[PDB]
Specification:
The chain has about 150 residues and is of the alpha/beta class. The protein is about 40% helix and about 15% strand. A 4-stranded parallel beta sheet has the order 2-1-3-4, with helices on both faces. Strand 1, helix 1 and strand 2 form a beta-alpha-beta unit. The structure holds 2-[(1,3-benzothiazol-2-yl)amino]-2-oxoethane-1-sulfonic acid (OIF). 2-[(1,3-benzothiazol-2-yl)amino]-2-oxoethane-1-sulfonic acid binds next to loops. The PDB classes it as hydrolase.
């Protein structure tokens, strides 16, 4: 379009780097990655500079999905440049809305990624203190939500 989407979670080391990687693969598989700007960022500064939690890498390797990212915090600019900001839970959503009201230009539509899930699992829960099966759940949620978002944005 070019179209753009920013996936957001608390740390940008587990949920949103997986979502970003899943989405980039989907558009690359459909020959339209050049039409999309895809990224991920954190609401917080807890993990800035760090790559995805290696448990998430292990999950993505199993599914054949390339993932390469260094954590960064969302900035005021992101609200002006992204068409969609898709986040994981209600705390992310609250924080993003708070930040968005501090800027003059907010192009982005800010929503829960789970609002796209055909299976209606609204919240994508933080797997950091969970186990490998929690990362797998997060992955599967991202696949379903990302596919539906690409098909038709709200
Ligand atoms: O970073 C993530 C996961 S994700 O938001 O990247 O999916 N979860 C955190 N839990 C904590 C808990 C304590 C301190 C810092 C952090 S960071």
């Amino acid at each position: 379009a070019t179209k753009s989407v920013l996936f957001v979670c608390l740390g940008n080391i587990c949920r949103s780097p997986i979502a970003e990687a899943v989405f980039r693969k989907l558009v690359t598989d459909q020959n339209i990655s050049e039409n999309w700007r895809v990224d991920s960022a954190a609401t917080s500064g807890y993990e800035i500079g760090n790559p995805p939690d290696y448990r998430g890498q292990s999950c993505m390797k199993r599914h054949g999905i390339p993932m390469s990212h260094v954590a960064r915090q969302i900035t005021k600019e992101d609200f002006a440049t992204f068409d969609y900001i898709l986040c994981m839970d209600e705390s992310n959503l609250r924080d993003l809305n708070r930040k968005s009201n501090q800027v003059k230009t907010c192009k982005a539509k800010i929503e829960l990624l789970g609002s796209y899930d055909p299976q209606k699992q609204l919240i994508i829960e933080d797997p950091y203190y969970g186990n490998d099966s929690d990362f797998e759940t997060v992955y599967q949620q991202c696949v379903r939500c990302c596919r539906a978002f690409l098909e038709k944005a709200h």
